[PDB]
Every structure is written in C-alpha cells, then in structure tokens.
Design an enzyme around this catalytic site. Structure first.
Site, mmCIF file in Angstrom:
data_model
loop_
_atom_site.group_PDB
_atom_site.id
_atom_site.type_symbol
_atom_site.label_atom_id
_atom_site.label_comp_id
_atom_site.label_asym_id
_atom_site.label_seq_id
_atom_site.Cartn_x
_atom_site.Cartn_y
_atom_site.Cartn_z
ATOM 1 N N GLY A 174 0.915 -1.038 -0.055
ATOM 2 C CA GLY A 174 -0.116 0.032 0.213
ATOM 3 C C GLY A 174 0.762 1.217 -0.057
ATOM 4 O O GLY A 174 0.151 2.298 -0.064
ATOM 5 N N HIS A 175 1.965 1.291 -0.113
ATOM 6 C CA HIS A 175 3.094 2.370 0.023
ATOM 7 C C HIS A 175 3.889 2.376 -1.207
ATOM 8 O O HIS A 175 4.761 3.144 -1.487
ATOM 9 C CB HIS A 175 4.147 2.156 1.180
ATOM 10 C CG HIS A 175 3.363 1.871 2.409
ATOM 11 N ND1 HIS A 175 2.542 2.531 3.110
ATOM 12 C CD2 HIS A 175 3.403 0.739 3.331
ATOM 13 C CE1 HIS A 175 1.938 2.102 4.249
ATOM 14 N NE2 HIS A 175 2.680 0.951 4.371
ATOM 15 N N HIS A 212 0.066 5.080 7.497
ATOM 16 C CA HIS A 212 -1.251 3.891 7.546
ATOM 17 C C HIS A 212 -2.357 4.758 7.878
ATOM 18 O O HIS A 212 -3.303 4.192 8.400
ATOM 19 C CB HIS A 212 -0.804 2.833 8.504
ATOM 20 C CG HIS A 212 0.394 2.254 8.254
ATOM 21 N ND1 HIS A 212 1.329 2.574 8.560
ATOM 22 C CD2 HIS A 212 0.536 1.019 7.424
ATOM 23 C CE1 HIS A 212 2.483 1.455 8.364
ATOM 24 N NE2 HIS A 212 1.773 0.704 7.476
#
Lengths: 356, 295, 356, 295
Positions: C55-56, C218
């Site tokens: 997700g990064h 996050h």
C-alpha cells in the site's frame, strides 16, 4: 477543494519557479515563460521542441534534457501556449540544424503552433512539424478536430529525441515521428474528474461506480459513461477498443519548409494485429495509486499475449497526467529493432532517466 | 467496551471488515521446523503443563494452544473435536493468529497489552469468532522479551471464570520455569568449567568435609589411590582408605603439611605418595585439601 | 468508491503478478510471497533486505535492484509480513557476507522482523538490523512505539544500498544506515484519507478545508486537525516542526550477531541548523498532482535558504505512498561529502534509476 | 462414590456423624507464627501465584487456600464474602482441615491420594459441606515428602471444569519452583566448594574459553600477574596482559606446555613466571588452563 496551491492566479509561476530550482539542468525564461535545456542552443543537432497547456506534468516540462526535448512551452493550465512563446523558445533552442515541433492535436495547439511555425520560417529558421493523434476513443472532441493527442506523445518525444541526439537530419527526425504516429494507439478512462484550480469546480461529475470511458486529458467527455464493474473488464473493453478503433484514415498537415506551405497529407493507421511488437505504457492520469497500475498491467499482458502481441518494453507511472484525475490510460506502440534500439538509447530528463 | 478492546477495534477498523474471514496465513512445513525447534525449551515445559491441565479437565469442549511471540501456533492440544472445529476455521499448526490477520482476539491481544486477556462473543472483531471464548496469557524470557503465549479456546456459552486464571497459572509455570531453568543451566555450566579445571591439575586432589566425608576427587587422585571416582563420593575418608600417622596428626592438629612423604593403604594395597595438606577453616568446621604431587 | 481492483482478496496477487511481468529483473516467489533480484543470491556483497505492508508502492518493491535492495517482503495491505516470509526471503538473498534488515518503526514490523532475525541467526546467517524512525510528528502513534518510520527509509535504502554495492562489510553498512537514521527528519500532511480496499470505508475523514497535520502513512492520526490555509502556511508549519521536533532522544534496538542478543542503544538526534547540507525529498503520499509537489518544493527552498540549509540533491515524486491519500511528506536528510558520493553512485531499480 | 471417596467414608463412618459439625481446631497465634515461618519458601511462591490467580478471576464467589502437610491453612485469599462464609464454619488461618476433623473433603483427600482431587456436594461426609465444592492438589518436596496443598473452594452450584486444573497448575508452579530452587541451591554450594578448592592451590591458576575471555583467576594468579580479581573477570585475555609469544603459538596451535619459563607484561611491568598450559577440548571449542608455579 483539496489543492496545495496559494493564490489561484499564481499557481503556475510558483510551480515553474520550483521546477527551475529543482533542476539546474533547466532554464526558466521570464517574459515570456518557456523552459529550455540549461545548455541550449546545443549547436549541431536538430533542436526538438514541444508544448501545450500545463496540467499534464511531467508532460512536457519533465522531458527536457539529453536525448529528448530541447525546450518546452507550457501555457496556462489546460490552455495552449501563444505563438510568441513558441517562436521565442524555438529560437532560443535552434542549433543550426533546424528545429522540430511536436504538436498534440488540439484546436488551440494546432492553431498556435502552426502560426509560430510560419513566424519561425519567416525569420530564416528551417523548421517542421509532427502532429500526435493517438487517442482512439472519439472523433472530433470538445477541443480537438479529429483524434486527440495523448500519452503516445511521450514515447514519440523519447524515440525522436534519441534520433536527434545521434546525428539524424531534420527530415529523418520528422518522418520518424510521423511513422511512429501511425503506430501508436491510446485510450484512457476516468473514475473521478480532475479539477482545474481557476475553475474551482470538478470538470465533470460521475455518479456511483460509473466511469468516463474514453476520457481525454483536459477532462473531455469520452465515448460514454458506463458502470465500472471491475479492473479486469475495464482493461478488457479498453483493449478491444484499441483493436476495433485501430484502423483509421485521416488528413494531417505538416510544414513543407522548401515550398513554404502547409502540405495536406492523407494517411492510414493499421490495427495492431497478431504477431506485432509493442512498447506498452500504462499511464496514471493523476491520482491512481501506482499499485493499481500494476494490476492494470497484469491484465494487459494477459490480453496482449491472447491476441499475439509481444511486449518488448514498458513504462508504468505518471507520464502524461490530467491534474488530479482518477483514471489511467493504456498506450501501445508498434516497434521493430531500429525503434527499440532508439528506445534503449540514453535519456537524461527529470522524468525519464536511463542509459550511460 | 473495555479500554483495551476499544483500542484494538480502532486498530482493526481502519484495515478490515467484520464479516469477511480468510484462512489465516500458515507457515509451510519446512520452515515451521525452524520455528518449532527455536522453542524446544518453552514447548517441552508448556506441553507437560498442558497434558496435565487437559488430563484433569477432560471431558469438556476446549482446546489449548501454545503460540510464540509472533502469534504462531506451535502446538495444540485438548478436546479432539474442538481442535477440529477450530481447525475448520484455519487454526492449525503454524497458523499465525496476529491481530492484523484475524482481528481483535485474546490470542493476539494478551501479548499486545502485556497481561492475561480474555475475549469472547462479539468482543471479537471478526464474526466467525462470535461463538468462541478465547483466553490467553503472554510469557516472557530471562531478559523480559515476550516469548510466547498460552491460550485456551472453547464455545462461548461454556466459558467459566476459572478459564483466564488457568492460562495465567500455566503461563506462570512455563515462564517462571524457563527463567529458573536457565539459571540452573548457567550455574551448572559454571560447575563443569570449575571441575574441568581441577580435572586438569598436575596434582592429584582430594577434599573432605569437617565430618570426614569425601567431597571431591579427581581422575588423577582416583588412579593414584586406586579409588573409583563415583562410588567414592560422600563416603567417610577413613573407611575409604587407611591414613598414615602423619596425616592422622595433621588432620587432628588442624596443621598444614608441605610436600610430605606419606604412605596410604587402599583396600590392602599400599601406595607411596608425596602430599600437601591444607585446612579450609569455615563456620561449620574445617574441611581439607590433600594434593598428591606426581614425584 | 474509485478502486481499480477485481475481487477484494485478489488485489494483492493481481498487483504482484503485474509487477513481476513488468520487471523481469525481479523474481516473484509463492507460498509464501516474496520478491528478490532475479540474480540473487549475488555472492560477494551484503544482502540488503526490507519490507512491510503493501500500500506504499513503490516502497519497497520498486527499490529492488543493483545499488539498493536485494529483495523485499510485501505483506497484506497496511500489514507487516509474517516472519516466515522474511526468513525465507533472507535465505534466498544471503550473499555469504551478511544480511542487513531495514525495519520501519512499527509494532508489527519490529516484532516480525525481530523474530525473523532470530530465526536466521539460529540457521547461522550473519545478520543485523537497522531501524528507521524519521516521522517527527508524534511519539507513540496507533501502530508505533516511539517515532514512525516513513519516507527517509527510501533515502537510507539507496545510500546503504550503494555502500553494500561498493563492497563495504555488514558492519559499516549497518553503522552507516544507523548514522543516517539520526540525520533524517520527516513530516507528512493529508488533505484526503486513504481507503484500504478491504475496509471499504475511508481510513479517516476530514471536514472541509481541514487537514490532518503530521499524518502517518497508514492513515494514523497526526498532531491534530487544523484548517488548511494555503500551501505556504502548510510548508511553513511543516518546516517549523522539523526544527522544533528535530532534537530527540530515544532507545533503538539492534541485533548483535556476535553475542546472539538484542543490544539496546540510547542515541540522540540533532535538529538541523545553520550550516547543514541536506538531501530533500518532497514526496507524494498518493494522489497529489506532481505539479503541486513542485509548488511545495519552491516554498521549501525559500525556507531552507532563510534557515541556512543548503539543499544539495533532491527527489520529487511518489516515493513513499499511502494508497490514495491526498497529501505529501517532506524529508530532509543531513549529509556530508561521503554521503553525496554514495547518493550519486549508480542505482538500477524499477523506481530509482540513475548512473552508469 | 468412586473408590477413593468410598474408602474415605469407611474411615469417617466409624468415628463421626454426617449431620453434626464442630468448628475444626485452630492453632494459637504464637505457635502459628512458627508454623507459617517454617513454610516461607512455599508461601512466598504460592501467595504470588494466588494473588494473580485471584486478580484475574475477580469477581467470583470463591476462596483459595495454601495449606501445609498437616492440612493447616497457611494463607487464604479470594472473595471477601466467601472467605467470610467459610470463616464462619471455622476455616481460618491456622485451622487444621484433616480428614479426622471435617470428614471426607479434597482439602485432605488430595494429599491422602497423592493427586489432584475434587469433592462436591454430598460426596463430602459432613452435610454442612454439601453446598460446597472443593478442589485441591497436593504438592511435593525436593526429596518427595508431602509439603503442602493448593485448594479452591466455592459454592457447589458454581464449580467449573477449570477449577481442578487451576489448582493443579498452581501446585505445579509452586512445586517445580521449589524443586529446582533447591537444585539450584545445592549446585551453588558445590560451586563454592570447587571454588574454595581452586582458591587454595599452590600455583596460581587462570582460565579462558574458546572466545579467549577470562573465566577463572585465583588469589595467587591475581597477585603474581598483578590483576584485580573481580574486574578482570569476563574480559578478553590479550587485553588483560601481554601474552608471551610461546603462549600465543601454543593457544593458536592448541598445544600444551610443561613447566615453561616465560615473561608476562602486565601494565608496564615485566613479570617472569614458569607456566603450564593445558587444552580443555570441548564440543564448542577449546578452553585452556594456565597454571603459574612458584619458583
């Protein structure tokens, strides 16, 4: 209204000032604005030059450097630059080997660049044009007569940029660009619109799980709107569209600098067909996570193989954007070994950096 | 609504839903070998503990887990059918039960909060777990590093108020046994070193109690005085071998003796040696060292 | 919802298959999932290894190649990988010269990588750890004890990657990355939350023209929410926090492979001051227009100049993202001359690619 | 009516009615001090076990006891109000709960049978006890005499499957901690003997391990090589003094040396000594003794 901007009419002069501070390999000219290689005029080579509205970063400003453009002319956001800019920049970059203008097919661009061309010609500058119409989605859009010029402009600027670098003559460069333009095929989709700063409001609006199919990079209406179902079947219809709307006959006009007039030239695109070899560019339209692009690429390679096309090189990222739009485009460009050899050549721009 | 569970939910809410459940990741056999081996000390303590708890709790429906620091299931026992109902949710040997994987649950929440924790019913973030009660207590190592968890799972209608303390009392035995087990291990390694030292002397060396009982004898004095190393220990010296005049006197007089020529009788054979004898004055009386030097 | 995905549990697989097809210089392993250099083990140098939640991207997968990471372990979206993946991945990349694990400071990662370290050690792989804790914004966040590890991880991966490549031993690599981690300072803001596809709802929600200040990657709460005022107010107060929260003392934990134990080590950060030379990373958190990043950059140089910091190198773009979150981070890393030589050294990864 | 209870009832039946209840004998204050203090080893472990058991079980109606081998209640805790209920029948500190006093009950039977036991309801001889359930686990001694009991009492309708194993998991911790706690004390006494032995050698003696780090130095090696005893410990040999070249070749090649004359340099001073060096080959590598003989 979530934009990192200050005063809404200052947007561009801050962004460009930043670009100039970020890259001392670039020169920002004031009165009027254009950007050139910090070392132009590079004597001995075809100076390669392009431009359009801002709002597509890194296109075109991020492609100034060795083995690509010599200088670029940004206009306001989503507006073509004016002749005085194009003229003045093309004369800053002139090397003595003529100057090649790459133009995206949009009314404003076509009009302004044409008039700059004539202006340049009259000042004793050898100069000629390549026109980019890859977007296969609609014919005659909101700002375009015929097919819009989108992501393939990046590939063409790269491949032509690399030929110019080598030593190739102005005509040689031009016909490469024209040849390549009848081999590139593009389509884009949007899940959420860009918003131009000056407008204040989104440039269109989609209801729930709806996508603009066949969108354009100034937030033009596409083929239609239709329920977004899944990334798979989105890539699927996109890919089928690229094949179905691949065959295309039309009239593009270039500057015959010998006769000093606009040569009309009818020319045909061939569909991509079994056995072809392609560079593929999966391109973020502004605000799609890179992660989802690889999902798009994954499905593409499945579709390509299924229809006998071989992916020889790829690019996956934000190469030709539309401000903050959520959507992506797929470009496929037919190649051979001369073309790939030009691809693998060095490039040293802030947005493309490979090779020795 | 415990302040714990509340936080756990704020952690889970961002990144999972309550109704979805996928088989939780499982470490594949070969590298599970290295995960299990890494804990032999903890597991051989913890299993004994769990076979006993089970033994006096059967029949009943529940399972008993030992997990490591990462929430990985090392071994399971208890009610066969219950282990299998949980097995039907993906709880298997080498399954990871982390919060990120299965959401809020004592299996992971105890380790996180650092003390025994029980979750049951719809405290659990995932719905699959709603007819379950889980008890788990974390255990730490010599340094204070979390090093495993004991857990107990059973159908929610059936939890008892003793379930949490049962896991805590077992965690206490295993943790507390590791720490003192390894303090033994150390002070035992220290003995083997200090012995190997005396085993490596040039001299024969023998020592005895204030009461007269042999304490130490080394391989070398064992050969010289023709005694059996083991069978000799703790046995009275004068019954072990008959001592010469000079030694009698010097034991009695608590005097020292330097390189004295002396004659011992072992089991009817006489042995001539040259000895050094030294009183070791203590509170409980005087011990002695006798050294037999190799001429 | 504007997610370019298929089934919600396949998104990670799809995207990993996409990455592997797009980049054949990388190898995708399965059961369990990890990613390494196609040519690993590269016998002879220190294996450099990192990972954390997906997700990064491009972090960490886009940073596998010569002159940087040997391999990565992606886990679920925003979720640490489990030690078995870390374990086997480090066994795939073992160079015979040690393995350096780079661990972002998060509860999950720390615990998981720490265990994987002990696993490897028991298998007799010389190994040590470097921990990144650059986020100056909050002490003890939602998923962190101490400070959060964000975009400075990418600079540190490159600089240490270069030392590894050059030939430096495990120890000097670890000491270097460890020095670096005391000289990098980072802070992020968000104007729009990221949504993780599995939760289906935004991971937080801000009111109109309100930003989460000192956000984490996050979608952890920042220092607070505060009205968004202008890009200038924002860069100013981001920059003042990098100074004010610059000075900082804490205990970090590294693995002493000689003693077979966790050695704790108290160490302090010096706040950047007049006379310092820095590398600056203006980082898109996911969905900020590149155009805008340059605007940020423009304001960043004014603030560095007036505080007496001399920006020597920069990166501008999407380097450490949080899915589709609208914001940016600024990283400033304090450098000297040996550091810059490591910076300019070659790098050949899908997301960073320069030098001979 | 399992054989166990059945047998216990034959003992009580002879000498005791099922309906009468006498408050069982309780030890006077002064002498209970000596009863308690005699058990300090057991109690400091147990009371800790039980404080924990209780904290994580509260709130619940029950009491936990630690008794000694004569079934004397040594300390109690748990639910205030349940304690008070049991206290009214006469379960207090110092109360004896032997079978001959209160009839068949786990408080005594556990010990009599040698294993964890649970008695509830009318399994108890005395009807007073019919609304109680008692679980107890006996716990044994280093050499294995009964040493005490851990017990849990609660209202009969509230016993749980976990109650017996909870007292077992506590007796296990306390028992095993006592067992190894005295294994430790004895291998520590041995450690000192062996020390006191090396310490009163004639030579000075030194050792280091396979890593090259001092493990043992005695009073006479310490004088002669001019080292401080304690601070030298653990420290690497070649940093502690300059080893003569003979020693280095003999540690590198791992050879022994009989009575070799060699120069040591310790902190700017040159010392002469005559030395013996012996390899101690072991499974992790080679350690060494150095002995320093007096001229």
């Amino acid at each position: 209204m979530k934009k990192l901007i200050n005063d809404v009419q200052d947007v561009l002069d801050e962004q460009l000032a930043g670009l100039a501070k970020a890259h001392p390999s670039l020169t920002l000219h004031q009165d009027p604005v254009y950007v050139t290689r910090a070392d132009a005029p590079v004597a001995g080579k075809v100076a390669l030059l392009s431009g359009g509205g801002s709002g597509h970063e890194p296109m075109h400003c991020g492609y100034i450097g060795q083995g690509m453009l010599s200088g670029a002319c940004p206009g306001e956001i989503f507006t073509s630059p004016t002749p005085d800019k194009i003229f003045e920049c093309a004369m800053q970059v002139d090397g003595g080997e003529g100057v090649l203008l790459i133009i995206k097919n949009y009314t404003g661009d076509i009009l302004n660049f044409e008039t700059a061309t004539e202006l340049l010609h009259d000042s004793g500058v050898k100069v000629t044009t390549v026109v980019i119409d890859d977007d296969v989605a609609v014919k005659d859009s909101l700002y375009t007569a015929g097919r819009r010029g989108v992501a393939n402009t990046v590939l063409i600027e790269k491949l032509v940029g690399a030929a110019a670098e080598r030593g190739d003559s102005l005509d040689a460069c031009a016909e490469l660009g024209r040849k390549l333009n009848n081999q590139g095929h593009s389509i884009g989709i949007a899940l959420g619109a860009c918003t131009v700063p000056a407008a204040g409001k989104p440039s269109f609006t989609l209801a729930d799980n709806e996508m603009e199919f066949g969108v354009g990079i100034h937030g033009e209406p596409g083929i239609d709107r239709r329920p977004f179902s899944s990334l798979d079947q989105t890539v699927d219809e996109m890919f089928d569209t690229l094949l179905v709307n691949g065959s295309y006959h039309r009239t593009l006009r270039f500057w015959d600098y010998q006769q000093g007039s606009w040569q009309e030239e009818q020319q045909t695109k061939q569909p991509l067909q079994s056995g072809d070899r392609v560079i593929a560019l999966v391109n973020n339209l502004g605000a799609t996570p890179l992660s989802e692009l690889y999902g798009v690429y994954n499905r593409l390679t499945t579709r390509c193989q299924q229809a006998g096309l071989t992916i020889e090189r790829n690019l996956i990222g934000a190469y030709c954007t539309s401000l903050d739009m959520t959507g992506f485009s797929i470009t496929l460009l037919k190649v051979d070994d001369e073309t790939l050899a030009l691809w693998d050549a060095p490039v040293h721009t802030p947005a493309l950096n490979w090779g020795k | 609504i415990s302040p714990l569970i509340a936080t756990s939910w704020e952690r889970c809410n961002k990144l999972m839903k309550r109704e979805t459940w996928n088989v939780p990741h499982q470490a594949q056999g070969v590298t599970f070998a290295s995960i299990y081996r890494r804990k032999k000390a903890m597991l051989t303590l913890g299993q004994a503990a769990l076979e006993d708890a089970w033994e006096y709790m059967a029949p009943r429906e529940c399972a008993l887990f030992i997990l490591d620091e990462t929430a990985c299931i090392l071994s399971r026992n208890g009610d066969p059918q219950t282990l299998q109902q949980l097995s039907a949710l993906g709880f298997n040997d080498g399954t990871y039960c982390a919060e990120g994987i299965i959401g809020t649950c004592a299996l992971s929440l105890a380790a996180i909060s650092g003390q025994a924790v029980k979750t049951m019913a719809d405290q659990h973030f995932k719905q699959v777990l709603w007819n379950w009660a889980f008890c788990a207590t974390p255990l730490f190592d010599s340094k204070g590093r979390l090093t495993g968890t004991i857990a107990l799972a059973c159908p929610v209608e059936q939890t008892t108020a003793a379930d949490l303390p049962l896991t805590l009392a077992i965690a206490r035995e295993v943790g507390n046994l590791l720490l003192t087990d390894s303090l033994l291990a150390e002070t035992n390694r220290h003995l083997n070193q200090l012995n190997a030292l005396l085993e490596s002397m040039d001299d024969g060396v023998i020592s005895w109690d204030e009461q007269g009982n042999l304490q130490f004898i080394n391989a070398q004095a064992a050969r010289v005085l023709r005694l059996d190393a083991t069978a000799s220990q703790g046995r009275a010296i004068t019954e072990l071998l008959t001592l010469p005049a000079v030694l009698q006197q010097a034991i009695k007089q608590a005097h020292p003796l330097k390189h004295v020529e002396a004659t011992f009788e072992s089991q009817h054979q006489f042995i001539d040696a040259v000895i050094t004898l030294k009183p070791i004055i203590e509170t409980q009386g005087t011990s002695f060292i006798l050294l037999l030097h190799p001429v």
